[PDB]
């Protein structure tokens, strides 16, 4: 009944890929409509402002695009992993990297609902599903980003409170965030920092919580990445997320999802770029016929489509495993690493096929190129992905 | 209940991969035992001889390894495509490329049962399933392989018999074949040679049918490959396979299975090489530790394992599609091309990891390296695969 | 005597490479000071402005960095090719791509003093060497860049004047230019586009000459690139550069220098990126020790340094050949193609070695990454380079 | 007044590349003639025997191909480094990896003349220059090839004699060698073998010296590679090459020439494959034209030609530096590593361009493919090459 991407008219067609159902296709169509009409037309302006509007967040919240795979009885929408993936994919197909929906719904809401108390869940989830409370997660610091145990941010108890001090960097949704999950060292006496880390829900408005100026980056112009500062912030007992000192444990449990998320975003962006480029060369007149008639272009496009389809098959297998809660760390790392790498190889060749116009911001491929470059870096660099993958091979 | 290759203890473990059932596992174990006892111990001798014995072929037929996925009511063993794939895979896992079982079972027996008459099927299939009648297919000629329009071998109608003249090169199982499917032009006056070709079943013993000497090759030392010559062979009317002048149609229908076969053999060979090399470096002492303790080696193995697992996912997806009769030519070409390229990339890096010993015929990786080099060439060059894949992209 | 880049303390050290003299080093040192003191400190401002100041051009001219290798008695600065290259290289080593000096001096001024008259050489060369007259070169058009036959810009002659019409795209120095060498079709009923093309000097001010607004690109933020328009510009008889319909001949003779120029800039930017990155990883610590101590990082740096040094050797060989006026089109195409691809390969790996900081505009590697991507596109795409290189191989 | 490979009619043409002179071109034509007439016609037979004839060695000696760049007053032919390189290159252009000439002349004879005694030089060099005494060098052992400290072969002083025990593997010219420079531990009491290693001249015939049978390899079919065993061989004081415990110092001084040698052989092999393949596709008919008319084939050839030419330029700069005795270990490592890697990349693409025929031993490209695979491994693996190169990048 369903075709796989290689046989589809377009890698981005609706109604394809075996892991989806007819009900998923319907939802897919609506999400695609949302990005096409509510995101794509305002993106150029958000790029200029360096951030998206609160309006689109509330719009996404109203249409039900936030907290999709978060249990309904907890304040989420209640869909399965496949529905949540559709939202990641469609955003990638729109080539609009500004809105930080997936970090919000795929990571932050996930930590809160999986390890938060009943009161934290009741206080945050509905607001986040509505898109009125924007979430962010802050682990990385100026001195440590792959070496989590090297974290310096710290929190020390003062009765029932916690005095939080330190700073984070490269925080997505940094500017617009209303709630930020902060990783901090709570036990300087623990044997290893891995046994002395906790998670704290820091809210915009607490005294001492300062948001730095938006960072100037080579890409992701509309994503408000920023530095965060904590100045002797007195945090109520309710700010502590999960058990004290069990923070590393919670991060480890959530990592697999974060990696698969990045992986699907990466391969979806590649499918976008391929179709975008396919279209360009078949339209670009040259030597009387289209650039698409040149043999070298045809072989190049074949190479790109093959690698893209091969990788999508693996990512879809991972989405299936994760749905069944059977996707382990190593497999998640393979997907993240291989897909993020492919995304940059595809972007590079696709810009080339566009000639000079590929270097112009007017053309989508231009921003696809700079937006792609960040994927092999965040969420655990690919060097780290290979390290983790090698553990089961040699040890 | 079933792990995929990334999570298994070894990429070659039995009981892994969701496309197989526990009944397939029982069968795989038995086939693996067969190669371990009836092929591996005698392969060195066969390399020297330049061909395997008739004995192993008959043992294979008796044990039920030939004609798997060939209709039982047609004289085959029956069983699904997955069972047939298990035999391709296990031969790859044994690193013995001598026995030409794959071409015989997956191609020649296929052409006969799908497009042959009751008489032809009754005459060939049972003895082919028994391993007493070895099959080969001959399309390639000295003048051209990638140029189908350049076939010179021809058959002239003389009364009710066919007069066949010409020659073919690079024919696998060419030396010990008992029946060979020959592609020849039967209508030179046809608009397109694609509509003027026919298939003929030539048997060993006919007058005018001459087998040339075994060709000296860089690898596949035990695979008897040779040139064939047809000198005014008077073929009975029962030598024609299928309808006259529709040979191109039949070839086009079998190609997808041929490409998929090559793809699975390639990815399976890669999995063998990976585990073989993984084992070697964990055992090779160096600098007070094992080569496997070196970070560069760990990352190299991670890269290899990741790419192999990713391709395995696409190939398994292709097997599933083919089992459903839903695998088209373009997808088959993607698997053939991508897997055969990976196979050589893997072999190169695995030889490197063995150091000097990787150049010694004594070590399996050495013959794996030279054996791997033929895959990107036969069954349609990877260059031809790209042209075919590009066809749907631009037209 | 002198050391080559592999043996030097740093690839960018002054006093290395056999093709330079002690006198060249002194010039080198003074050129290095200029960029550090007059370019680097203000580049960020120009990036935001979208163009450099006319002041920096006058400072460059006054200091004798504009028009090197241009005959002194022609109003130039004199000096061999090695001196002109030093200015290209040092601008690369400063990682400041804003000022279009090399085009102005290495391209525009070369055309004027090689195929221009004394009335033109006397008029333009003096003020161009002073940085008061900024030149450009318009060849590429919206319809085609690579397909030379696709030129729509035509110059119908009227009496002794010429009626210029058409448009250009991607014109570097498009905003600051005071004189632009325009390529237009003069002889339409010409057999080949070699007997129908002419070079014109369109000075700023002539009616009908319309400069479009600066183009928004992914990189070269400080390089004013614009679209140029021509709506019936009456051109004097002196506006014609060289012989009518002889443009092709002029361009073909200058192309080598342009290719060598891009190649040296590409390889120099690679040497800069390497030393920048080598320094970064030696000062960055993680998981206990400096990133530079990781074996993977070490081998990566060894690969980068090796490829960079091998390519530098080729480029210097090309500078020598060009000095003796013996660099052909093919050899120059090899240099431009290989060095431009290597530059992006180096940039990618160097961004990865900086981790997240490599994505921040604050770090030089970030702008170096996006600035490098233009090289394989302009000055003739690398695809065109291969075509040209292939011509003598098969034809 | 000379063209660089990029501009020549063929990358293998005589009279090109700035480092050579018209005198060199004359010698070049002569050497090329030697391989076409005395080697090419018999290589197939040698591949089956797994070793070349002692006759081709003596013929090479008589025509002055052995000992080039080995001082004439020392028993060699003399000539500069460029002349010795011509012999390495021409053998590669012939696509005959059988004759172990380069090793014998560019390595073994070099050790002897650069660190041997006047007596050792008198006895060995003359007959080696004549091709009467074939040389081999043995460092690698069963359990250690990239690990120096792993060497187990050892020699103990017994009076003025040396007792040698151990074994080596992968020894080129192993079967027909008359003299072998053996690396052995002479002082394990030292902090590192870098100060406890000595070189010895082991000769065929000495009691206890055993040659193993020829090893079966994927390529280099006519190159007699073998393992060697030393069983309490009583070596006279004269067997010691150089000073006791200074072996490492000598090996260290010779490595750059060894790496440069492999480097030149690697890039030269690539030049041969390119022209061989270029010829094939221009001659191969397809679609009523030649495979060379396909745009993909043209671009692929341009890519190969460019990389080969870029690498040749670097290798020639290294030849010029070594001529002046100014070639660094790190620089020589860059050449050995980069050229051997490119050689295999070129081999792979060229086999592909030949279609099925590239898999047939009949065609030159097939043996060139398996012959190339050895280069990234011996003379120090490419991984070791990177390690050495990284030293000055990260430390100091
Ligand atoms: C735009 C953007 C958005 C991001 N969003 C978030 C976010 O929302 N929240 C958050 O907390 N962080 C986020 N990050 C930070 C990101 O996760 C880190 O940059 C990333 O984890 C890399 O850490 P680092 O920058 O400290 O690099 P480092 O850890 O310093 O690593 C630098 C280099 O050393 C290499 N290296 C280090 N260790 C090894 C090793 N063991 N083996 C081999 N190589 C190694 C790294 O791979 C890299 O090549 C984001 C970053 C960017 C750029
Ligand atoms: C920032 C920037 C600055 C520039 N500055 C100048 C300048 O100052 N003056 C000037 O005149 N130009 C300049 N250019 C323009 C530049 O020279 C052209 O963009 C370049 O020549 C490519 O032409 P195109 O963009 O039309 O690509 P196209 O010709 O459309 O090519 C598009 C794709 O088709 C491929 N293709 C086309 N022909 C072949 C072929 N025959 N074989 C295989 N593939 C082929 C191309 O390689 C590319 O992959 C600049 C460009 C940029 C981006
Ligand atoms: C045909 C042939 C001819 C030869 N001729 C000679 C000869 O005449 N005389 C002689 O003495 N030797 C010769 N050799 C031997 C050759 O020098 C060695 O095989 C080579 O140095 C590799 O050593 P090894 O085989 O012990 O591999 P090992 O040292 O075991 O290395 C195995 C793998 O580990 C890798 N590795 C080891 N160390 C590191 C590291 N530090 N970092 C990252 N990776 C590492 C190696 O690169 C390789 O990938 C020859 C070899 C062959 C194949
Ligand atoms: C060991 C071995 C076993 C084999 N077994 C069989 C068998 O049993 N029966 C049988 O019939 N055949 C068999 N073959 C033959 C094999 O199918 C052919 O060699 C293969 O199809 C390639 O054809 P060719 O060798 O004629 O190469 P050619 O067609 O000459 O191609 C030569 C080069 O040109 C390239 N080229 C051709 N067309 C294009 C294009 N249009 N665009 C770009 N590049 C192109 C090719 O890819 C290749 O790079 C086998 C081959 C080998 C080596
Ligand atoms: C380019 C838009 C990508 C949106 C999904 C990003 C998912 C990973 C976010 C960063 C996670 C981390 O680094 O902790
Ligand atoms: C390495 C052993 C592979 C055995 C299966 C080979 C299948 C393809 C055989 C050649 C088919 C053809 O080219 O017509
Ligand atoms: C990154 C700065 C490069 C400065 C030198 C550019 C030389 C080529 C300019 C474009 C030439 C052309 O496309 O006609
Ligand atoms: C293909 C023929 C190559 C001839 C030169 C080989 C040079 C390296 C020989 C082995 C050196 C060593 O491993 O000690």
Author numbering:
A (entry chain C), B (entry chain A), C (entry chain D): 34 to 428
D (entry chain B): 34 to 429
Question: Which passages does the manuscript contain on this structure?
Answer:
LCAD is a homotetramer containing one FAD per 43 kDa subunit with Glu291 as the catalytic base. LCAD substrate specificity overlaps those of VLCAD and MCAD, and in addition includes unsaturated and branched-chain substrates. The structural basis for the unique substrate binding cavity can be seen in the long E helix, where Pro132 is located in a position to cause unwinding of about two turns of the E helix, thus creating a large cavity.
In addition, the structure of the Glu291Gln (E291Q) mutant complexed with lauric acid has been determined to 2.0 Å resolution. Although we obtained crystals of the LCAD E291Q mutant co-crystallized with substrate lauroyl-CoA (C12-CoA), density for the CoA moiety is not observed, and only weak electron density of the alkyl chain portion is observed, likely due to hydrolysis of C12-CoA during the crystallization process. The crystal packing of the LCAD E291Q P1 form is very similar to the crystal packing of the wild type LCAD P21 crystal, except that, in the P1 space group, the adenine ring binding site now has moved slightly away from the symmetry related A and B molecules to avoid steric clashes, transforming the P21 space group of wild type LCAD to the P1 space group of the E291Q mutant crystal. The chain starts at Glu34 in all four monomers of the mutant LCAD structure. In all eight monomers of E291Q LCAD, electron densities for the substrate fatty-acyl portion are weak and interactions with cavity-forming hydrophobic residues are not seen. Likewise, the overall structure of ligand-bound E291Q LCAD is similar to those of both the ligand bound and unliganded wild-type structures. In all LCAD structures lacking bound CoA derivatives (all eight monomers of mutant LCAD, all four monomers of ligand-free wild type LCAD, and the C and D monomers of the ligand-bound wild type LCAD), residues Ser179 through Gln182 in the vicinity of the CoA moiety of the substrate are relatively disordered in the absence of ligand.
